Ligand SMILES: *[C@@H]1O[C@H](CO)[C@@H](O[C@@H]2O[C@H](CO)[C@@H](O[C@@H]3O[C@H](CO)[C@@H](O)[C@H](O)[C@@H]3O)[C@H](O)[C@H]2NC(C)=O)[C@H](O)[C@H]1NC(C)=O
Ligand SMILES: *[C@@H]1O[C@H](CO)[C@@H](O[C@@H]2O[C@H](CO)[C@@H](O)[C@H](O)[C@H]2NC(C)=O)[C@H](O)[C@H]1NC(C)=O
Ligand SMILES: *[C@@H]1O[C@H](CO)[C@@H](O[C@@H]2O[C@H](CO)[C@@H](O)[C@H](O)[C@H]2NC(C)=O)[C@H](O)[C@H]1NC(C)=O
Ligand SMILES: *[C@@H]1O[C@H](CO)[C@@H](O[C@@H]2O[C@H](CO)[C@@H](O)[C@H](O)[C@H]2NC(C)=O)[C@H](O)[C@H]1NC(C)=O
Ligand SMILES: *[C@@H]1O[C@H](CO)[C@@H](O)[C@H](O)[C@H]1NC(C)=O
Ligand SMILES: *[C@@H]1O[C@H](CO)[C@@H](O)[C@H](O)[C@H]1NC(C)=O
Ligand SMILES: *[C@@H]1O[C@H](CO)[C@@H](O)[C@H](O)[C@H]1NC(C)=O
């Protein structure tokens with residue numbers, strides 16, 4: 001009758017009640033997102049409140065089982081999951097104020113709008129208006145207008161809230177025995193109590209910085225290439241030696257360079273692989289796309305989808321009568337009920353997305369046997385890393401030929417491979433300095449290294465040093481540029497995207513070894529090759545029951561993050577870019593700006 | 597024999613309080629067992645299914661209960677889990693057949709059917725064919741237990757059955773036929 005046995009009894013009761021309440025909450029959420037109506041809003045909120053009240057009661061009860069006497073790591077991990085109070089550690093007034101601030105920021109971002117000069121009646125929302133301007137317009141002044149208007153009208157409403165937010169979140173984090181809120185976020189990667197696999201919170205910062213330095217030689221060449229092409233697009237606005245203007249990168253924040261592809265195409269006289277016409281000519285629909293994804297997973301040795309998946313999932317747009325959120329998601333409702341919510345259209349992008357979301361569902365299925373509190377990925381970056389390797393494999397020409405969408409006699413050559421790799425580099429590599437610099441900035445803000453009076457001054461210096469992007473106009477301390485992004489205004493961890501990207505390649509290379517693949521890594525197809533499927537499955541079924549360093553070692557042969565698989569993936573692109581840049585400056589000066 | 601009153605019944609008993617009906621002084625016909633449902637499992641341990649009509653026994657008992665699909669593998673000699681240990685346990689030396697079928701269309705409701713209870717906490721393992729329908733509060737801690745509380749748990753939990761759950765969490769109706777031989 002020791003404390004460990006009482007804790008195990010407690011957790012068993014928790015897992016049963018939690019599965020029932022969680023299921024009810026997840027189903028109500030599903031019903032709302034697939035059938036949008038006020039009655040479902042009330043049902044979603046009532047089930048959500050029931051779930052939250054349950055967790056608060058169980059968290060309170062969980063404080064009676066100290067972890068110091070517990071020897072079993074599974075029990076200790078489940079108790080850690082329940083004992084943290086989070087916002088419950090704050091006084092009632094600060095908690096209501098913090099939730100007010102978070103709701104205010106969400107409201108300001110979601111409904112923020114700007115108006116055309118001298119035309120108060122013609123006003124654009126971030127989506128689709130400004131995003132469309134930033135993605136498709138080639139008029140320098142229009143792009144700058146959208147940039148500045150968003151930063152002034154929205155950034156200056158969020159700034160004082162971000163200051164109060166940072167203060168309240170740091171107080172909360174300190175009350176939970178963390179150095180700052182940055183350590184709260186980095187606690188997701190903490191391993192403590194497994195000899196040889198331990199990973200401190202502070203260590204995460206160092207590892208990210210080391211991987212970034214290794215990446216730098218590749219990024220600097222990609223950046224320089226893009227600069228030359230943009231010089232032709234904007235002949236009088238880009239310095240051959242300086243940073244790129246932030247508003248010219250193809251997005252609102254410069255998070256991705258994917259929309260610059262049409263200007264930077266290596267060999268523009270040849271097409272990219274696009275099998276949309278093949279899917280239309282063959283009379284494909286959403287059902288065949290999902291069945292082909294299923295065949296992909298079955299081929300590698302993973303299980304078939306359940307009957308409930310095919311009967312309850314919403315794979316097509318319900319139509320004009322029944323509204324739904326057309327944002328692809330993979331749902332695990334608990335107790336064996338797995339669903340995908342997508343508004344599938346016949347296009348190659350949705351084909352790959354179907355593989356991505358199926359890649360998530362297979363993961364949710366693999367760890368379904370774990371205790372309720374451990375039914376998640378090893379860390380925040382594993383779930384998407386798995387989905388991305390599934391998308392990455394499905395896209396290779398070998399796959400398209402084998403399924404029958406790419407012509408049997410299509411002949412790949414090096415110019416097509418370079419066009420493919422540049423597009424991938426623009427979406428995978430061009431986003432890493434952004435994610436690193438942004439997360440690093442927040443860490444320094446929460447820690448207290450950057451005083452409030454220099455938040456933006458320091459922000460722009462870092463952007464120039466790490467990313468190579470310079471503001472087109474100066475900004476004083478009344479602006480809040482970081483908060484103009486969804487993942488900053490709302491309380492989300494952004495490091496997920498840097499870490500996940502490296503994992504994506506670490507897994508893919510190891511699987512390619514299991515498949516006995518020869519030749520360039522980017523052409524690797526892990527179809528069939530049941531050794532790769534079993535290798536991945538052995539990790540996927542673990543959920544959170546093991547340290548992420550071990551879950552990673554079980555697939556790639558290493559206990560930490562690395563970058564070599566990524567650099568190898570893009571190796572022929574790096575060589576090509578080095579060749580293209582022999583007459584160009586590689587790197588950048590931080591003194592030049594469009595302003596001066 | 598009246599096998600249809602066991603297999604074809606409006607409601608099966610909860611596994612914590614399984615229904616043991618005794619069949620005696622009768623002529624059995626086991627081919628009718630295949631007229632009630634497609635079965636998840638029909639597994640005999642001490643007898644051959646195809647020879648059931650050639651044996652004579654003094655008593656046959658039909659143990660009727662509802663369990664989860666993932667728990668069907670526990671109705672067997674030598675198994676462990678919340679059911680093999682705390683609700684219904686077969687002896688290691690067992691003569692009989694374990695019949696299970698999917699009942700999702702009859703027992704599940706959208707709100708959730710909470711009228712099927714199982715035991716998860718007990719002081720000791722059950723003996724073969726022992727039944728315990730007590731609702732006393734289980735004491736997990738060292739302090740005397742007075743009602744529900746910090747280390748005081750109700751020993752029974754209900755299964756929430758809903759038509760959309762995966763196969764492993766749908767209700768299954770299980771009938772175990774135990775064949776007993778004595779005299780006459
Ligand atoms: C993984 O293995 C499967 C087999 O288990 C491979 O699928 C098979 O691919 C071949 C082509 O390489 C198919 O043969 C062709 O079928 C078409 C049907 O119209 C026919 O016109 C061609 O003349 C040829 O016979 C074969 O049918 C197909 N098998 C199945 C069961 O679908 C698959 O290609 C392998 N994966 C990869 C990436 O290659
Ligand atoms: C930690 O506790 C879990 C139970 O919560 C143990 O898992 C059990 O291990 C036994 C080993 O014989 C199995 O038969 C059970 O089926 C397992 N149960 C569950 C729920 O997984 C685990 O082994 C314990 N670990 C340590 C290191 O003591
Ligand atoms: C939030 O979590 C902490 C532990 O992480 C709780 O801390 C204990 O609370 C009890 C009262 O319930 C105190 O007697 C203990 O001294 C606390 N322990 C520590 C380590 O200080 C805390 O109670 C929880 N928050 C609230 C609001 O109760
Ligand atoms: C996965 O499910 C399918 C049904 O969706 C199973 O059945 C096969 O389906 C394909 C569909 O093209 C048929 O061509 C095969 O003939 C079917 N097989 C049989 C034996 O009839 C498939 O077997 C299931 N696979 C796994 C691994 O569970
Ligand atoms: C959508 O929700 C409303 C809520 O009243 C319900 O009546 C309707 O049947 C639901 N429709 C679907 C397709 O789920
Ligand atoms: C492709 O290979 C040919 C071989 O002659 C070479 O001349 C050409 O430059 C290569 N192109 C790329 C993009 O690597
Ligand atoms: C079977 O269960 C019913 C209630 O569901 C009960 O009335 C009946 O007496 C039980 N039969 C046996 C043999 O225990």
Ligand SMILES: *[C@@H]1O[C@H](CO)[C@@H](O)[C@H](O)[C@H]1NC(C)=O
Nearest residue numbers: 600603604605606631632633
């Ligand atoms: C079971 O009972 C129902 C009525 O409840 C009847 O319609 C059905 O035919 C019966 N089935 C068998 C196999 O006796």
